[model samples]
Target: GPSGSSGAGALPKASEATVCANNSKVSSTGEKVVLWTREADRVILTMCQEQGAQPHTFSVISQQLGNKTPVEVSHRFRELMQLFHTACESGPSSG
Candidate 1:
């Protein structure tokens, strides 16, 4: 995890239109920030030493299966996108 922590460098898990290279900004102590993710942005932020943490959430929603028209089979024809609860609070991997 970041070559045993502290240098903060270990990035390789962005595959689904990965083109991320804007050098994302940092001028520190002089301040000039613009940390790019603007393809509609879900999450991905980082700044440390002045303290800022925990960010990396971006989503294009594809681990596989595109163009088969399968959004969980159209969410069973939409009951508010169909995610009803109370199956005992999800045990056994929630299925």
Candidate 2:
């Protein structure tokens, strides 16, 4: 997959930025619609992502078990770096 041209913040300086902000597409397909699967009670999806394919299967799960438990997905590399720094500084040695 090709890397996206720029970050969300970098849009103002680039020509392609307006296209994204205005939601413009040059595809020959009649209508460009994003297809999202409707949620179902007992539907299990099997995934086999080949190499170079961006993401494998993703699911929502909560670390805390209870009613209204909060769930979150994994962070990107940048977010993980910040988390790593925070953890290191907050460990026993820092206190």
Candidate 3:
């Protein structure tokens, strides 16, 4: 059940998107990087879980970040990529 340490409780969870200021970097030890929000992190994890962790998953998200869509959606989509890239450099997380 959820009460078990190995259950959902043990899974790491991201904070709210508002917690991260837009344009902030994920780390200071790398090239000038961009930070992503907790909300974006959820989207990345959910997509990986739904579509399987693979390059195609990123492609799908990339398509979502574009110039022909609503401004807000595009902005959110862009943030997702930033977080995804940061994760890639940082190494793998729970699938």
Candidate 4:
């Protein structure tokens, strides 16, 4: 008679954050970049953030979107936040 069992697991789930930090290597811009980061934080923090988004991901997306995108994305982002907040809030609150 014989029975066998084996199991092994190794994972670096949070390591992506480490990799994404490569953005800090950015060669141009300075304080204004930091300033823009705050605004982008608001945008991506709301948009990409619903799933599994985070620090550097937000940093990159906002920076990637650039000046032109914010105007459009702002409409979309604001529309969603407002509409969803309105609908979801009124959705299941009847008691």
Give me the candidate number with maximum TM-score: 3
1-95 per-residue lDDT for model 1 (tens digits): 55664556677877676565675233221111263122211111221112222121111111112222224222321321122322233234422
Evaluated at residue 21, the lDDT of candidate 3 is: 47
lDDT of 1: 0.25
Q: What number of clashing residue pairs does each candidate have, in the order they appear?
A: 0, 0, 0, 0
Residue range with the least summed lDDT across 10 consecutive positions in model 4? 23-32
Give the alpha-carbon lDDT of every model: 0.25, 0.26, 0.49, 0.47
Model 1 Cα RMSD, 1 decimal: 24.8
Residue 78 deviation, candidate 3, in Å?
18
Write the residue-wise lDDT of candidate 3 on 1-95 in tens digits: 56645534454676666564477444622223365445444544466568754555655544444332234434545555665566655633434
What value does the lDDT take at residue 71 in candidate 2? Answer: 19
Which segments of candidate 2 are over 4 A away from where they belong?
A: 1-56, 60-71, 75-79, 88-90, 93-95
Highest-lDDT candidate: 3
User: Which candidate would rank higher by TM-score, 2 or 3?
Assistant: 3
lDDT of 2: 0.26
CA error at residue 22 for candidate 4, angstroms: 40
Over 1-95, each residue of candidate 4 has an lDDT whose tens digit, in order, gives 69889989987566533343342222211123433454554545455666334434444454556853545455444554555445533434334
Report each candidate's C-alpha RMSD, comma-separated, in the order given. Answer: 24.8, 22.7, 18.1, 18.4
Off by over 4 Å in 3: 1-34, 65-95
Estimate the TM-score for candidate 4: 0.25
